[PDB]
Amino acid sequence: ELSQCDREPIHLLGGIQAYGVLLAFRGPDRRLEVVSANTQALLGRPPEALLGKTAAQVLPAELWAQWELLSARGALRVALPSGPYRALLHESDGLTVLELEPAELQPDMEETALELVRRLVSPLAGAKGTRELLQTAANTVRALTGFDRVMVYRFDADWHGEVLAESKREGMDGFLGMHFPATDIPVQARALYTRNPLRLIANARARPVPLVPSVVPELGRPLDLSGSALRSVSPIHLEYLRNMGVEASFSLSLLKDGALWGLIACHHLAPLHLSYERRRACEVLTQLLALQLSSEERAAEAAEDSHRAALLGPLATSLGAGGTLEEALAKDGARVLELTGATGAALLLGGEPLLVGRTPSMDEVEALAAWLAPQPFQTSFHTERLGSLYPPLAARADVAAGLLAVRLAPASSRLALWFRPEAVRTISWAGNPRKPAEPEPGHARLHPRGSFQAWEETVRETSPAWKRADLAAAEGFRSAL
Amino acid sequence: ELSQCDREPIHLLGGIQAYGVLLAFRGPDRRLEVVSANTQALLGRPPEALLGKTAAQVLPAELWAQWELLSARGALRVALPSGPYRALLHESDGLTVLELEPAELQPDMEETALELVRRLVSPLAGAKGTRELLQTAANTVRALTGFDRVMVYRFDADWHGEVLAESKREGMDGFLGMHFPATDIPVQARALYTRNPLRLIANARARPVPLVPSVVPELGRPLDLSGSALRSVSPIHLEYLRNMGVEASFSLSLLKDGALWGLIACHHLAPLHLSYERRRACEVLTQLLALQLSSEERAAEAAEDSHRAALLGPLATSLGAGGTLEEALAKDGARVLELTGATGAALLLGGEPLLVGRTPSMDEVEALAAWLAPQPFQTSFHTERLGSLYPPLAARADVAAGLLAVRLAPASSRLALWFRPEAVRTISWAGNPRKPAEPEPGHARLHPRGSFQAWEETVRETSPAWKRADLAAAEGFRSAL
Numbered sequence A, B: 001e002l003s004q005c006d007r008e009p010i011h012l013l014g015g016i017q018a019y020g021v022l023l024a025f026r027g028p029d030r031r032l033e034v035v036s037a038n039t040q041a042l043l044g045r046p047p048e049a050l051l052g053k054t055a056a057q058v059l060p061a062e063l064w065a066q067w068e069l070l071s072a073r074g075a076l077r078v079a080l081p082s083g084p085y086r087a088l089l090h091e092s093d094g095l096t097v098l099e100l101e102p103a104e105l106q107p108d109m110e111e112t113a114l115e116l117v118r119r120l121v122s123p124l125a126g127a128k129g130t131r132e133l134l135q136t137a138a139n140t141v142r143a144l145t146g147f148d149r150v151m152v153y154r155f156d157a158d159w160h161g162e163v164l165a166e167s168k169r170e171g172m173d174g175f176l177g178m179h180f181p182a183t184d185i186p187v188q189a190r191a192l193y194t195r196n197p198l199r200l201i202a203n204a205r206a207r208p209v210p211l212v213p214s215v216v217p218e219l220g221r222p223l224d225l226s227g228s229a230l231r232s233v234s235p236i237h238l239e240y241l242r243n244m245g246v247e248a249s250f251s252l253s254l255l256k257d258g259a260l261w262g263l264i265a266c267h268h269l270a271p272l273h274l275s276y277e278r279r280r281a282c283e284v285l286t287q288l289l290a291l292q293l294s295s296e297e298r299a300a301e302a303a304e305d306s307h308r309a310a311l312l313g314p315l316a317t318s319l320g321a322g323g324t325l326e327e328a329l330a331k332d333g334a335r336v337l338e339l340t341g342a343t344g345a346a347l348l349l350g351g352e353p354l355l356v357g358r359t360p361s362m363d364e365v366e367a368l369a370a371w372l373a374p375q376p377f378q379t380s381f382h383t384e385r386l387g388s389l390y391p392p393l394a395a396r397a398d399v400a401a402g403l404l405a406v407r408l409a410p411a412s413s414r415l416a417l418w419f420r421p422e423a424v425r426t427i428s429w430a431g432n433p434r435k436p437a438e439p440e441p442g443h444a445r446l447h448p449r450g451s452f453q454a455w456e457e458t459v460r461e462t463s464p465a466w467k468r469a470d471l472a473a474a475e476g477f478r479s480a481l
Helices: A037-043 A067-073 A115-121 A132-147 A185-196 A235-244 A276-310 A312-318 A327-332 A333-340 A362-372 A454-460 A469-471 A475-476 B037-043 B067-073 B115-121 B131-146 B187-195 B235-244 B276-310 B312-318 B325-331 B333-340 B362-370 B391-396 B452-458 B468-472 B472-478
Strands: A023-026 A077-080 A082-090 A097-101 A149-154 A161-165 A200-201 A248-254 A257-266 A381-382 A402-406 A414-419 B019-023 B076-079 B086-090 B094-103 B149-154 B159-169 B197-202 B248-256 B258-269 B344-347 B402-407 B415-420
Touching: A067 A082, A067 B159, A115 A132, A115 A276, A115 B276, A132 A149, A132 A161, A132 A257, A132 A276, A185 A257, A200 A276, A248 A276, A257 A276, A276 A312, A276 A469, A276 B115, A276 B276, A312 A327, A312 A475, A327 A333, A402 A475, A469 A475, B019 B037, B067 B086, B115 B131, B115 B276, B131 B149, B131 B159, B131 B258, B131 B276, B187 B258, B197 B276, B248 B276, B276 B312, B276 B468, B312 B325, B325 B333, B325 B472, B333 B344, B362 B391, B362 B415, B402 B472, B468 B472
Parallel strands: none
Antiparallel strands: A023 A097, A077 A082, A082 A097, A149 A161, A149 A257, A200 A248, A248 A257, A381 A402, A402 A414, B019 B094, B076 B086, B086 B094, B149 B159, B149 B258, B197 B248, B248 B258, B344 B415, B402 B415
16 A cells, blocks of 8 residues: 555565575685575574584585586476475575475376476467467466466556456456556566566465565675565565465566566465476476467568558549549448548548548537648647647547547648547446455455556546557558549 | 389388387287287297287286376386386277387486476577578487487478478588479378377388287288387388488478478487487477467468568559650569569560560560460469470470469450479579489489489479469559559
8 A cells, every 4th residue: 555566676575485495605615694584494403503604514415416417407306305395596696596495295207397388289289369379378277287267468558457368267257358557567576577487476375584684785785586486575466466365376477579578377266386397387388478479469460561551452442433532432431440540530622521430520620620730740640648739629538539630632721630539438348347345445456346447547538559550551542632 | 112112001011110019908808919029038938928818917017007097198117127118008900009118228317307398498599580490490409319410391282392401410411402202202101290290210220020910800901000109111211211321210290280391300320219208308399380380481471461562662663753664664674573473574565565584585475475365364374384285385494384474454465474484493403412322223212313303304394383472463463554
C-alpha cells in the first residue's frame, strides 16, 4: 500500500527464502562472508562460529572436491549425507557466491533428464500461428508441471499488460479479458526480469529471512542477487501474491531480440517445490518459444502488409468503374474503413462529405474540416487524445478519441480524416472477473474488482495507437485525383 | 548392380548387425522366437538350446525385474553380469520385440544428460536465415559426434537430392554441389526414413548375422525390423560406403509437416559406434528443426511476396517518366528479368518485341509468337520441357528449355513470354568431385564421378519449374496499357 511499490529497489529487500544457503569466497584466499541463519543448520555449525575463520576449515572438502568441475558446469547434484542436493556457483560484486538447494528426492529412475523436451515438443508439430501455439504451450505446461494455474501475459507500447490466454484446472475461474496495469510492475523489476532467464516462487507462506551481517563496507550496500534463484520479492508484491492466494508460482520470460517480449506464469494453490530437472529444462523452452514467436510475428506482419497492400486491388475494381467516385467508394465502404484501421472516414468534395460506419456530427464534420487548416500538417497528423488537442470533440469523444487525417487535395481545401473511438467497446465485457469476494479487501493491490481501475482510468479517453504501414498506403489514395 | 536396388524391400533383408542380440516373446505366455548364433554367446547356451522352452526359462529374469517399467519407459541401461547393456522394447508384426545393445563402455561419470544439449543450444544465437541454421547445426554436430564428416541433403518435387551444405575435417574431399538421382533412393526406403527418427551404421566391415529360424509359418517371411535401431542395411548400400571407404555413418530425418524435408548424415573413416547419450538427444533436434524450418519458410515466402509486390516501385521508376514504353522498360530491363526468374522476356506490339538477357533469334521469335496462337491458352502456359511441347525449339535447349508466357491482350495477338533455358550455366561444375578413382570402378554404384551422370541424363533439355507468386503477378503487367 506504500507509495514506493513502483519505487522500492528489489535489490535492497535483503530477505531470503526458507531453503537458501548463503555462501561466498574472497578472491585468492577465498575468505568467507555474510551467511544466513538457515544456512548453518544444514552444515550443523553455528553461523557466528563459522564466520571469521578460514575457508577450508568451514568447508566440507568432499563437496569442494567438485568445485573444479563446478567452475565450468555451474550446477550439478551431489548426494549429501542428508539427501540429494544441487550445487550452485555464482559470482557478484567482485565476490564469488556458492549456493545449495534440496535436489530431486524422488529417485528418478524413469523420466530422466532431457525427456521433458521430447515429451513436450511432440504436440508442437505444426507451429502455424501465434494464439493457438502459446495456448497449446500452456496446455503442455499443464501436463509437465502438473499444477493448478498457468497464465500468459502480453505487454503494450507503454507496457500495460493484457490477459491473452491461459488454461485452467477444473475447480477455478478463468481470467480472460482482464487488463494488467503497468503501474504495479516497477521498471527495476522489469529490468530484473529482462536480465535473468527464469524465476520461481514456491510458497507464499515463506518469510523474507534477513541476512547477517546486514551491511558490507566494501559496497555500503548489500549483495545483489543476480545468479541466485532464491531472491525474495517486494513486500507489496508479496502481499499481492497473498491476496491472489496461490502459494506456488512460476515465471517464464520471453525476450524479443534484446527486449523482453512477454512473461509466462504457472501457479498452484498448494505450496510445492520443483525439481531442478523441470526448472532447468524451461530455459531450453524459452529459446524455442522466443524464436518461434519472432518468426510467426514477422510472418504475420508481412502477411498483413501484403493483404492491406493488395487491397489496392479492390480499390482498382471500384476505380475506373462508372458512376461518381463517392458512390463507388460508398458501395465498397467497408473495405475502405479497415484499410486504415479507423472505424470511419469522411472526405471534402467542397460540398457535403461522404462518411460511413461511425457517424460524426455533420456540422461538426465541416467545423473540424475548417479547423484542420490552421494545423500545419505537412504530410499528416495522428493522435490518440484528440479531445486534449481539440476540446469541442470531448462531447463526441467515445465516438472518436484519436484519429488520422491527411490532405485530400494539397492545393485546394479538400481534406480527409480517419476517426476511431475510445477503446472500450472493442474488447468484450470480459475485462472484469465478476463474482465479488465476500471478504472486504483494500483492493488497491487486487486486480479482481479492486485494481484495473487505475488501468481503465489511464486508458480512459484514448484510441489505440497508429501504424506507420497504414500511412504508407496513404500516398496511394493521394494519387486518386 | 542389380536392377532391384530401387525395388528391393528393405524389410526382407532379414539380417542383423554383429553386436545386436535378437529377442522376442509370443504374447501372453511370451514364448520365444527367431534367434541368431552370435546372440547365444551373450547368454551362453547355444541358440538351439534356447528354442523350445518357456519365456522365463530363456529369460534372465533379473533383467525382467525392470520390464514392468520398460512397458512405459521403453529403455534403460542394465548391468548384465558380463557388462552393461541397454534394454529396448518394441512390437512388430503383431509380436513383441525386445532388444539389448552394448551400452556405453565409457564409465561416463561425465558426458551426463542434457549437458550436451546445453552445449548445442548455445550456438543457436542468430537463427535468422535458412542456410546458417543447418550450417551451424552441422558445425555443432561436428564436435558432438567427433567424427570425420557431416552432410546435408535436400530433395525436389520428384525428390532428387542436391548438396546444400557440408563441413569437412582436414584431410579429405569436399562434396559440395552435386545432384543425386533419387532413383538410388527407393520409395520404400524413403518411407522408412519418414516414419523413424534415427538410423545409424557403426561399421561397414560388420557382417550380416543370420537369423534362425529364417522363415516362420505364420508369415512365410522373417520379422520386420521397423522399430529396431539395429536393422541391417542392403549389401548395395554397403558397397556404396565401401567405395566411399567410410564404415561409420549416422542419419537424420527431416520432416516438413507430414512430408520428409531432407537428410543430415555423419561419416567417419574408422569403424566406431555412438554413445547412447548422444543418440537420444538427436531425436529432440528433429522436431525442433522441423517446426523452426516450417516457420522460417513461411516467413521467407511472405517476405518474397512483399518483395515481388515491392517490385512495383522499381517498375514505377519507368512508368510516369516521359518516353516510349519500350525504351523505358528496356533501360531497366535488367531488374525485370529476375521478377519472373526467366533470363529474358519480350512483349508483342504487333511489330518487333524487345527482349534482353539471353536471346532467341528474332525471326523465330516471331515464329514462336505465331505458333502460340493455335495453342488456345486462356491466360498463360507454364512449362519446363518446351522441347517436348515444341520440337523445333528443342534445338536451342541451351537458349530455351522451359518458359512462361502470358497474353498482353486477349483478343489481339499481343502476348508476352518469359523464356528460360536448361539450368547448365546456372550450376557450376561442382557436380563432379574429380580425382578419378585409380582402381577401375563400375561407377554406377559409386557417387564420385560415375553418379550424377544419371541425373544429368534425366534433366537434359529441361528448365527448372516455375513458382506461383510470379504467376499471380502476371496481372500486374496486364493492366499497363
